[PDB]
Amino acid sequence: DCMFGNGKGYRGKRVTTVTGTPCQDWAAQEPHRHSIFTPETNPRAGLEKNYCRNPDGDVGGPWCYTTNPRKLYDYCDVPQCAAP
Amino acid sequence: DCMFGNGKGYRGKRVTTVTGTPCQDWAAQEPHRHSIFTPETNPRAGLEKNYCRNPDGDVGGPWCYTTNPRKLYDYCDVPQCAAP
Numbered sequence A, B: 001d002c003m004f005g006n007g008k009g010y011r012g013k014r015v016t017t018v019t020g021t022p023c024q025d026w027a028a029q030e031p032h033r034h035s036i037f038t039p040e041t042n043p044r045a046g047l048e049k050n051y052c053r054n055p056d057g058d059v060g061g062p063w064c065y066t067t068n069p070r071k072l073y074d075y076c077d078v079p080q081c082a083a084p
Helices: none
Strands: A063-065 A073-075 B063-065 B073-075
Touching: none
Parallel strands: none
Antiparallel strands: A063 A073, B063 B073
16 A cells, blocks of 8 residues: 555555544545535546545645545645655 | 645654654665665655655655665655644
């Protein structure tokens, strides 16, 4: 369970942010509403359940909306696949 | 101990690749000889001890030469710092 590059292609099952806070499901609008990055706005980004994803190829890598009421989003720690 | 972006500015003290192999010192020429990426070729990149670094700002983030005589180099796992 690892990514290549910035992980725009990453479809792994990591669900935890770098602080320990779980991800919010992409389909959920609670605790956090989100007008962007829903499974309907980004249908080919693999926004399934609450997996860490990088739908916009952010320089920071895979992230998610967090269940922390006070923090909207955060990065996840998804390792780089070992070099061949 | 975390980075921003692709980790070109990361100056932490992580020293293990994603497989758990201790990194080789940048100054060292064993177990792997390397004429590029030493403290005396990239003096502004913080190629110190065997700390994971991204001197060229490669998409895959921080890496190092490895102490594994059969693996030249590999990525390290340096987490993005928590989002501000």
